[PDB]
């Protein structure tokens with residue numbers, strides 16, 4: 001429905017933008033340009049060097065059902081070749097426990113998991129589709145805990161919480177089930193629970209760097225876009241060094257932030273203003289009494305413990321002078337959010353409690369993480385509206401807000417965007 005000769009501007013060279021480029025190009029659209037604000041590609045797949053090995057400041061892992069990322073590796077020749085992930089569980093006092101072996105709670109949890117699985121397989125078919133343009137069951141629009149309570153599956157939250165809340169995506173009291181279950185669908189949940197998890201020796205960034213290089217048009221970097229306007233059936237992009245016209249705009253960058261440098265119409269301003277996000281903070285640490293395994297702290301995943309370390313990543317087992325990254329959240333809709341300063345101190349205090357005291361923090365990043373909307377906004381039909389706007393003034397909406405904030409979901413979405421509107 002769009003001509004192959006169209007000049008397509010793709011904003012952002014993260015996974016979503018690079019995938020958009022890949023799949024446009026493979027569909028015969030050769031006149032695309034990817035515009036990246038920073039000097040690097042990969043976005044939140046960001047794998048810096050330290051003493052000859054790359055550590056992860058952002059994304060780390062995948063599961064075997066990451067089919068779109070497999071397609072990307074097929075193209076780049078990259079392989080899943082990183083160190084194996086292994087985990088223990090700690091209480092907030094640092095004591096090691098084995099929740100799977102609890103003879104009372106364990107069965108309750110796994111019975112709820114069984115029950116939920118069947119609801120997903122029968123009543124809630126369609127729940128796991130990529131994106132939100134196929135309207136999900138109304139129950140899925142409620143916060144996850146409410147969704148679970150409606151079906152008597154509350155205890156299943158013990159299994160779902162670990163790769164969700166600890167992983168920055170927020171808390172089941174408020175995050176709609178729709179996101180939780182598109183990310184952690186039954187198969188994905190099962191893979192995680194099993195530890196069947198992809199990692200990369202060269203970092204998740206590496207395959208995106210390699211993908212960018214395979215493109216007919218590798219991303220243009222250091223592009224400071226000051227204004228985008230969309231008059232006369234055209235797209236006009238003003239940057240600090242040039243201003244140029246395009247036929248189509250594909251956005252893989254934060255849509256609320258897009259309002260600030262664009263001729264955003266009333267609907268764009270109205271809806272994109274409803275976007276909320278997570279403040280997910282990662283500290284790259286050198287530690288004494290080096291851990292022997294990664295640690296998760298369910299106690300610190302409760303909203304009452306906001307800002308505490310929920311998980312830390314043991315990446316390079318053989319070298320106790322390698323980087324251990326820690327993970328915490330600074331926000332929750334029903335709490336005063338936490339400062340960088342007080343959270344950094346909890347990193348220190350928590351790691352000390354866990355028996356792996358921090359000697360040095362070499363890097364720290366609060367990420368713009370998991371853009372989404374509230375249950376109320378989801379229920380009021382946020383996605384019916386925005387997806388209805390796809391193509392308005394030659395503009396297409398993609399990236400994390402349109403799908404889910406993991407790198408397979410956004411790439412899958414970019415791939416399908418080509419199929420939906422372009423081919």
Ligand SMILES: Cc1cc2nc3c(=O)[nH]c(=O)nc-3n(C[C@H](O)[C@H](O)[C@H](O)COP(=O)(O)OP(=O)(O)OC[C@H]3O[C@@H](n4cnc5c(N)ncnc54)[C@H](O)[C@@H]3O)c2cc1C
Pocket residue numbers: 011012013014015016017035036037038040041042043044045057058059060061062223225252253254280282367369399400404405406407408410
């Ligand atoms: C700590 C952490 C851990 C994670 N763990 C995992 C994991 O284990 N597995 C997984 O699948 N996912 C994980 N993720 C999520 C995953 O990294 C993201 O969902 C994915 O990178 C999203 O891709 P994207 O292209 O939509 O957005 P992004 O990765 O954020 O890329 C956006 C790009 O657009 C650029 N940009 C922003 N504004 C502008 C502008 N004004 N003009 C031009 N360019 C702009 C940015 O610089 C960036 O390059 C993790 C993320 C973090 C932060």
Ligand SMILES: CCCCC/C=C\C=C\CCCCCCCCC(=O)O
Pocket residue numbers: 060061062063085086087163166167168188192195294311312313314327406
């Ligand atoms: C199902 C996993 C794919 C998506 C993951 C998305 C976000 C992850 C965010 C942060 C992860 C912190 C990692 C700590 C190491 C885990 C070790 C283990 O689980 O065995």
